[model samples]
Target chain A: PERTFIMVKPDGVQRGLVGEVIQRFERRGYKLVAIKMMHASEQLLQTHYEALKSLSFFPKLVAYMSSGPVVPMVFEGRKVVENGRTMLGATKPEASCPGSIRGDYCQDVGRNVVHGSDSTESANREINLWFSPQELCQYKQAVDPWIHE
Target chain B: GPERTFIMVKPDGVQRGLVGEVIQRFERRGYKLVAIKMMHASEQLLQTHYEALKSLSFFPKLVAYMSSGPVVPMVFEGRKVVENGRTMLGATKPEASCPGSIRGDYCQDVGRNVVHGSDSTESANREINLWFSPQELCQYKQAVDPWIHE
Candidate 1:
């Protein structure tokens, strides 16, 4: 099974969409290996968004991430990286479709809720960035056969 | 303003690990969680709960699916939760479900849809009473209420 990294941003947590975010992937039959809620430090935010460090909005991103608590999680399943991204919808909430996380609840670009690994390599990096090997739980669900062909 | 509604993550939803998702939507929409529990419902309880549908052809199938596994029952308090929750759930059939709604995004069939929100305030009261007790409900507040309620 492939693994992907996902998180409910500070705005999402403050708005209380943690369960809604978890539901999108869970309903898709993804296996949750780990999850936690806590405040992210500026250092951690910088490290996580290192690829965007040179962007003009980097400071705002960091500030937003550090504003409140967030729920970081790891999910395992086939094509989780690609599927997770689709589930999160567009980075700009207005551009996202209705069924997606951002599409359903968010309205602004900066406050656009939720995050997911964008690629296989990013999934690995982000998964490692957010979760240690020991923290990831391995398990099975009884309905797996029905979800996947 | 305060109103309460009963919602359930049905067997299909619970087995798929969607309990948190169901809770998240209502919570994010500025609703308060007053009661929550997970259990396999009794046949008698199911019978009473579905009494209105007892004469329907699909009642047997509904009961079977509902009894197949554990379910999460919850109560949410907020303004117009009974009506807004129905909107959040989208249409009953997945194909007719809207993109931003829960059923629209996750469900493909009415039979295997993810969650249930009460259709009216009266139904909400009845269902909440049926599934939970006064002790099960709680009082609380969210730190960011000013943003959500105003």
Candidate 2:
């Protein structure tokens, strides 16, 4: 199974949407292998979003992300990287679709409420950034058969 | 100190294994679980629960879909829970749903939308009545309640 990293932004926690965010992935048959809640430091944010470091909005991104505690999670399942993005919806709330996470709940691009790694390469990078291998669970649930072919 | 709202994980959600996710949302938000049960709904129950949609041409399909598998019906207790619950579930159509919402993240079709929540207090009362008896509800305090409320 492939793995992807997902995060419920601080705004989501403040709005009481942490469980809602996690629930979506769980219900979609994704296995939650690692989870934690913490406030990100400026250095961590810079390292995690290094690709975006040169962007003009990088500072604002770091500020908003660090403003509160966030939930970081690792989900494992078939095509997790590809499907995870679909579940996250578009980067811009206005451009996101209704069935997507951003489309249904968010209104502003800046406060889009969640973060999902964009691809397998990014997923590996983000997963390494957020969780140690020891922190991820390895057991298979009995319901795995029902969720996967 | 609390309000109650009714919520249901529809048949599709059950088949898709969304019951835990549905319940966890309310719990994580600091809402209390007042009542919950899983059952394959009868036509009569479906009629009462979705009475407003009865006159629509697709009513039969709605009923059939809802009755296709076991559904997890639940009641949540919290301030403004009825309104907040709706926000958590998102729009009925997957395409119209937001990424963080239940429907937005899970659904792709209106017919297969995964969950339902009371639209108002009155509707919540009616739905709760239709789905659960008073005894089915459990009352208690959570250790984290202090952090969630006030």
Candidate 3:
């Protein structure tokens, strides 16, 4: 099983696009493990994007993350990380591949819409940082056999 | 075929104004919303319902958050609603949650995951009973049923 981390930035939330966003995932048939409505802490944001600390966009990213509340999630499926990235499209909205979330709903790089972990390591780290083990519930989906092995 | 399941949107969604958005998704997907109601869970009821988590450190927070607002309780009928809805919710972590999930869209933290559903058939049954009276579970048919069916 593969796990991937995904989040809806403030724009998605304040703009009232939450339901439309979730519908896309449901349509794709991925199972949810844990979820929450949370305000991002500076510490948490800094930790998640430590690599970007030296970059110019880091401060703006952190400010926006803390602006309101962002929805965080963990999705389980085969090749979830890579597929999720593809689903999210590119960081730069205009260059984002068509049919992805960013490509469809986002147009600005500063607020390119959603975020997803880039690799397996980031997925694990993010899942732990955002949700406690007790918050996660595991079970078999009745439709799992049809969707996956 | 799978048993029924319980699905709910918390008070925050209601306060933030998302009741229609949440319900429409389930309806469009062809799930039978067997039960539905707008009610508030009392502290005592929440304690009994979440009996297993009474000892956790976050128990108090759970109750507070739950009772903080009115929740829309629903029983959604589908082949695998309990499991299927979980997928639709995405990961609990805001950062890890996918863009296309309920959590990914409306939620801010674990304390405020905008939606909740039973994790299993058993839990679904229990939740449905706790939140809705027998009569609240409606029975009806949609005009486009043939499309969802094969």
| Per-model DockQ against the true two-chain complex | 0.19, 0.13, 0.03
- Candidate 2 per-residue C-alpha lDDT over A21-112 given as tens digits, one digit per residue, 9 for 90 to 100: 88878766678899999999999999989998989999999998999999999998766677678877889989887767788899998888
> lDDT values of the candidates?
0.79, 0.83, 0.72
Report the lDDT tens digits of candidate 3 across residue range A75-127: 77788889888888888989988888888888798887788899999899988
lDDT string for model 1 (B1-150, tens) is 488988888877766687787787788677866665556677788888888899999998888878877666778888788999999999999899889998987888889998888898888888988987765565545676676776
Top-TM-score candidate index = 1
Model 1 misses residue B75 by how many Å? 16
Q: Candidate 2 on B37-76: residue-level lDDT in tens?
A: 8888999999989899889999997788778778888899
Among all windows of ten consecutive residues in candidate 3 chain A, which has the lowest summed lDDT?
A14-23
- What TM-score against the true fold does each predicted structure earn? 0.57, 0.55, 0.55
Position A43, candidate 3: lDDT: 96
Docking class of 2: incorrect
TM-score of chain A of each: 0.95, 0.96, 0.94
Off by over 4 Å in 3: B1-150
Of the two candidates 1 and 3, the one with more favorable DockQ, higher being better, is: 1
Indicate the DockQ of the complex predicted as candidate 1. 0.19
